[PDB]
Design a binder for these strands. Sequence first.
DNA 1: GCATATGATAG
DNA 2: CTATCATATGC
Length: 155
Amino acid sequence: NYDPFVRHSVTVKADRKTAFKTFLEGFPEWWPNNFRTTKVGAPLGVDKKGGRWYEIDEQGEEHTFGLIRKVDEPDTLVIGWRLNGFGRIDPDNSSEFTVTFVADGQKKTRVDVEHTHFDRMGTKHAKRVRNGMDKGWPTILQSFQDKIDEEGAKK
DNA sequence: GCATATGATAG
DNA sequence: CTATCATATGC
């Protein structure tokens, strides 16, 4: 994706609320990217009342990790581009996407992202994205499903 | 366009 | 390490 269109694909083994909880609140409780303190990895991750991804740096708020357009409870999250305090590219992309959590049996949730405009920036814009984002959030989604897999299936 | 540099991708 | 690809700075 992210060259023609952006799609997200994640299967959660617990339910949509655990998915939403993990995705937007449980930032500090994963271990793929947030594996830090006052960094990418702090006691927050995202702001609920405004819809904006931030964590608690020692000097204030560490990395902005998204500009949320829609914070629609355990259901849907439309967010925009933002990344880690690393060797990253700036939010020159906007990269917005509709995170669609589909509740299955209320103990499973398949999320699909659908967006097509800023995400299409693949090739050039995605190569500068590759700087540090490629080694974080895509990795997050793996441990996301696994941490959650332990929440009500494995552990 | 070339020397950087950073960042990923080549070898 | 040199390159080669992209992007940006720097000249």
